[PDB]
RNA sequence: CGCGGGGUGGAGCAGCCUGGUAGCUCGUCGGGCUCAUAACCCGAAGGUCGUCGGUUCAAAUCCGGCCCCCGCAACCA
RNA sequence: UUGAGCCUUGAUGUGUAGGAUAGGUGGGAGGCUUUGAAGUGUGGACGCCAGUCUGCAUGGAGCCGACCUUGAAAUACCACC
């Protein structure tokens, strides 16, 4: 996970809800290199309809 | 240094590096006195001999005009007739199975505890409460014998006891700092002779390493 | 593994109101008989005033707030091996822990009277030597030479 | 030597050792700890515990410096990081400079299962 | 020609300054373990801690002697 | 910068058991403290966790053996090593 964020925090991370099995998160879209491709759909959302 | 008001103000009389002559000292020893209690002179005698071997171990006792620096309280376990003989030569406390009980329970008025060897049956049952005070007697030193009246008279006219120390030291003191001076030369050698006598058996060539005399806390004396 | 289960906490002692009492007479009840173990405990002060017990305050008080167990001994597996590891002793059984003993001390004791062996059991414990006060401070010097795991 | 009231401070944890090394800007050793200097081994000398000791150690090493804030820098996964973090207020100490100073040191990637737990 | 250490079931070693007190490894006779065999682990059986003096309520032990062992060792005509 | 050595200074002692870190060894009852401990607490430190040293709020000559108990054996106050 590699992350920096740093003081108020106890019992050694995994801090997000649902993060891996079943869902969430990603892995939707799990081939051929697409991998975070998701966050980046969801984030240029706008409709998901689209004609 | 470092060092107390009651020693401070006697270096006000002494100096710190000399040795005194017990000749020439005669009226200097009362005067270097400070204490809350009686001062004595000891001596300090290096051995030897082997500083390990127990066979060459030194121990006795020997007569001094003032003992120990006091008179003793002597106790004296004997039956019959012999007792009354004792009670008259030095004996302040006469001895029988009575006194055995409470030496045992843990109440004694006494310096000195000399028996007969027929009496000695009884005593013979508190060794080990005499033991660690070293109020024990035993045939082997003489504190057991027939003539008891002499034995307790041996221990009143006054005795100082001892042995070698670890590595080979012995010390002994020799007079109160206010007894006579002029005597100290005298009884020193009285000391000394006796000592001298007390060589062990399988002793080599020396006995002596070197003999230093002071005072309690305080300046050394020359020979 | 599931289960979550149902517990008890047991009956008064029907003289004294006392559930403390009660765990104690269950801890001294053998062959199921359960009334000969009130006839042994707190059936005489006579035979504390014997000994080191000083007033009736005291007289069962001695077991309960004179000691404070804390930890258990024995080994733990971690990751791929086994290791000895001082272990939490549950809130509910922390006073109740040396009841045993106390009851084993008394019981195992080859001294005929078995209400005068506890009651020189109980004595024992008010001096605060050796039986049940040592086996409390023998695993809290072991957890004091041991503290990497829990 | 005097009283500075200033310092600069690295924390490690892993999940084989934990350390605390307190020195100055200009380069000066003031203080340093180890799970090792402390006398842990094997499976133990990577320990939450293993750490909050080792912090108290390095404490003792700079007693006279006079120093209350000092600028951290924190390194490694390791679980030592949370218990050495707040062996700080232990230590006496307040902070205002405090940086993850850990490799990345590329791009991802898979977060483990194991270790926790 | 001397000194240090040693004498303990069948072989080789403990020790000291807890004197009220025989420990051990290795083997042997048996298990754990095993498909056996290896690697690791621990029950059971058997001896005067030599020997003559000594201190003592008490020493295989400590303190004195002896003897057989195990390691080091020196000189006048 | 340090090897060896000598004075000065300061403290060594917990086989083991509890009230208890009984050094050796010989004495011995009145001896020592007035920035001085007691005693429960927020603290510092060595630790064999018993104990001791220092600081602050304080209170200010005690305290201890003998008494009472533990043990062959003592436990204020002290040479000597």
């Known amino acids: 996970i590699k992350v920096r964020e740093n003081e108020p925090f106890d019992v050694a991370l995994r801090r997000f809800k649902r993060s891996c099995e079943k869902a969430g998160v990603l892995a939707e879209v799990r081939r051929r290199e697409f991998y975070e491709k998701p966050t980046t759909e969801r984030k240029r959302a706008k409709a998901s309809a689209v004609k | 240094a470092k060092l107390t008001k009651r020693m401070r103000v006697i270096r006000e009389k002494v100096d710190a590096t000399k040795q005194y002559d017990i000749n020439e000292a005669i009226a200097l020893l009362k005067e270097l006195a400070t204490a809350k209690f009686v001062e004595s002179v000891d001596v300090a005698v290096n051995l030897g001999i082997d500083a390990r071997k127990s066979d060459q171990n030194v121990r006795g006792a020997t007569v001094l005009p003032h003992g120990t620096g006091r008179s003793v309280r002597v106790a004296v376990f004997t039956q019959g007739a012999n007792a009354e003989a004792a009670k008259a030569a030095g004996a302040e406390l006469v001895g029988m199975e009575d006194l055995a009980d409470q030496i045992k329970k843990g109440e004694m008025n006494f310096d000195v505890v000399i028996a007969s060897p027929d009496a000695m049956r009884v005593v013979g049952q508190l060794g080990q409460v005499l033991g660690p005070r070293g109020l024990m007697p035993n045939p082997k030193v003489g504190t057991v014998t027939p003539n008891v009246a002499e034995a307790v008279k041996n221990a009143k006219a006054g005795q100082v006891r001892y042995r070698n120390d670890k590595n080979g030291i012995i010390h002994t003191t020799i007079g109160k700092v206010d007894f006579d001076a002029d005597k100290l030369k005298e009884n020193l050698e009285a000391l000394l002779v006796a000592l001298k006598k007390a060589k062990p058996t399988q002793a080599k060539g020396v006995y002596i390493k070197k003999v230093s005399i002071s005072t309690t806390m305080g300046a050394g004396v020359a020979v | ?150 | 030597r005097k009283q500075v009231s200033d310092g600069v401070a690295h924390i490690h944890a892993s999940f084989n050792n934990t350390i605390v090394t307190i020195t100055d800007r200009q380069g000066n050793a003031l203080g340093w700890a180890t799970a090792g200097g402390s006398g842990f081994r094997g499976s133990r000398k990577s320990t939450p515990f293993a750490a909050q000791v080792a912090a108290e150690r390095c404490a003792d090493a700079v007693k006279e410096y006079g120093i209350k804030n000092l600028e951290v820098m924190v390194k490694g996964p390791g679980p030592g990081r949370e218990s050495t973090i707040r062996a700080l207020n232990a230590a006496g100490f307040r902070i205002t400079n405090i940086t993850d100073v850990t490799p990345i040191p590329h791009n991802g990637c898979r977060p483990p299962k194991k270790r926790r737990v």
């Open chain 3, 1 to 150: 593994r599931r289960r979550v289960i149902g517990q008890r906490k047991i009956l008064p002692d029907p003289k004294f109101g006392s559930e403390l009492l009660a765990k104690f007479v269950n801890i001294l009840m053998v062959d199921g008989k359960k009334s000969t173990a009130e006839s042994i405990v707190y059936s005489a002060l006579e035979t504390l005033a014997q000994r080191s017990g000083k007033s009736e305050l005291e007289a069962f008080e001695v077991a309960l707030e004179n000691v404070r167990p804390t930890v258990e001994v024995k080994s733990r597996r971690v990751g791929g091996s086994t290791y000895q590891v001082p272990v939490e002793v549950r809130p509910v059984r922390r006073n109740a822990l040396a009841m045993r003993w106390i009851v084993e001390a008394a019981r195992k004791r080859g001294d005929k009277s078995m209400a005068l062996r506890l009651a020189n059991e109980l004595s024992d414990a008010a001096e605060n030597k050796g039986t049940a006060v040592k086996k409390r401070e023998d695993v809290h010097r072991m957890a004091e030479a041991n503290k990497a795991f829990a």
